[PDB]
Ligand binder design. Structure first.
Ligand SMILES: CC(=O)N1CCN(c2ccncc2)CC1
Length: 121
């Protein structure tokens, strides 16, 4: 139908916008601490601690499958990356501090995205 095409056009444009957000967010992680899933060969008991792992690569996979229906779903996954890290790692680690910095700096990008999503429909 024409409506389904229109809808898919909107989703495609959302995906274009979220891909830009994702690249902007990943820039704020230059050490690339959050680029890939935490390795179970490197952290065998990770899943005993963290029940919903997340990372930038996994987000990108869902993104390209147009699996984010709105900005809120995308933000949920971003928050998972940060919150998982701030629980698994102690306050005085380079990991915890990297999450804090990624959180604080990412806030600007996400503030704009919320307004762009709202204004452009
Ligand atoms: C994202 C996150 O929490 N981490 C990623 C890096 N990491 C390891 C990497 C290599 N070996 C052991 C651990 C644990 C902490």
């Amino acid at each position: 139908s024409m409506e389904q095409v229109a809808m898919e056009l909107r989703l495609t444009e959302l995906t274009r916008l979220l891909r830009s957000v994702l690249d902007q967010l990943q820039d704020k992680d230059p050490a690339r601490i959050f680029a890939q899933p935490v390795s179970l060969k490197e952290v065998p008991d990770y899943l005993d601690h963290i029940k919903h792992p997340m990372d930038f690569a996994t987000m990108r996979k869902r993104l390209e499958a147009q699996g984010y229906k709105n900005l809120h779903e995308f933000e949920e996954d971003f928050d998972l990356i940060i919150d998982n890290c701030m629980k698994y790692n102690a306050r005085d680690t380079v990991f915890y501090r990297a999450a804090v910095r990624l959180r604080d700096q990412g806030g600007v990008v996400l503030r704009q995205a919320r307004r762009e999503v709202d204004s452009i429909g």
